[PDB]
Design a protein around this ligand. Sequence first.
Ligand SMILES: Nc1ncnc2c1ncn2[C@@H]1O[C@H](COP(=O)(O)O)[C@@H](O)[C@H]1O
Length: 392
Amino acid sequence: MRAVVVGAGLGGLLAGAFLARNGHEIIVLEKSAMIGGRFTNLPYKGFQLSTGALHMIPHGEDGPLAHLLRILGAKVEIVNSNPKGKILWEGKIFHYRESWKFLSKLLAEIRMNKLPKEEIPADEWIKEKIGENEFLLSVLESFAGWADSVSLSDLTALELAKEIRAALRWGGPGLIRGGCKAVIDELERIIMENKGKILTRKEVVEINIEEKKVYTRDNEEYSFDVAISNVGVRETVKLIGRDYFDRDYLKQVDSIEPSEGIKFNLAVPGEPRIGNTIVFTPGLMINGFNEPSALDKSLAREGYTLIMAHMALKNGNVKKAIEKGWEELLEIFPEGEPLLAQVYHIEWPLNEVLVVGDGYRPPGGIEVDGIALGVMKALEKLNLGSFSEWYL
Ligand SMILES: Nc1ncnc2c1ncn2[C@@H]1O[C@H](COP(=O)(O)O)[C@@H](O)[C@H]1O
């Protein structure tokens, strides 16, 4: 069939690649002059920074994203973090396993697939099931900030449980050789080698459901059998037209408030300081940081190591937050020199048009693995793809 993809972000390119591979006619329409959206590279002062993800995948080689890339025929080198993760507490960075020493479990239950019937905040359920441990609640707060850009109290016990299940199933994160762009380049190649088209500088202004045609600002017409939107729920509703949605759904969409985050790109002189791993920072505004060049050295500038820290903004003041961000990094990395700070239920009702990308991350799906999980679900909903429940 004919599929028109609106937006060339990770979700859009994954869907386009999968469908093109399966013999469908794919046309990707990208508004900007470059593809990749918030999952590609940003050359900057001799460093390969990113437009979003920290050149890392939440579950590395083991999650939904890696699986999708493998079955698509993408050749991308993803290496899981040495220890799955580490923690910075009371002046020391240690292996996550050491954490138990701060305690006097339910992971076994989550392993058994048994999730909480409880409908209470995640911080509340942790206190009850485990206890009010000042260390644990602090680390889980960093996890929530890093993986979901919210406070632990902002997650339901069920959501945290599902993310915990995902971690037990697919393990820790992994770095990408070549950065995020490596993935983008492969998806672009797969689409082009499978009869697909990728048109940049094509801004979609209307997804007409009745005519089944997509219109661009420059008046070009593209008819479709299926349309895949990688532009987010709110914008997609606008492109289609509000009248095509139920009143209560429009209420939910108009109520969506994106959770902002701040990224700190730090140029530390010398050799890698942490290697292929992530470091949670309980107690700080920053939630954690990684060292992408620990795998691909070309990502950093000569004689330098690239450090990327993530900070969930919440209701923080940008100027103050950025300042507090560099302050904490100065304390952790005295020789570090600031490079750039970057600032970033009713289900979808239609079937001819579906949404993929950050606007659709199924429960338990973290960041880009969450994006990939959404693409899998969309494909199944279209009865155009089938995936093991090990990934769903
Ligand atoms: N109206 C539009 N038509 C086509 N592409 C768009 C439109 N709005 C946003 N985009 C692109 O959609 C992509 C979504 O990227 P991301 O936010 O990473 O999913 C970006 O590459 C945007 O430039």
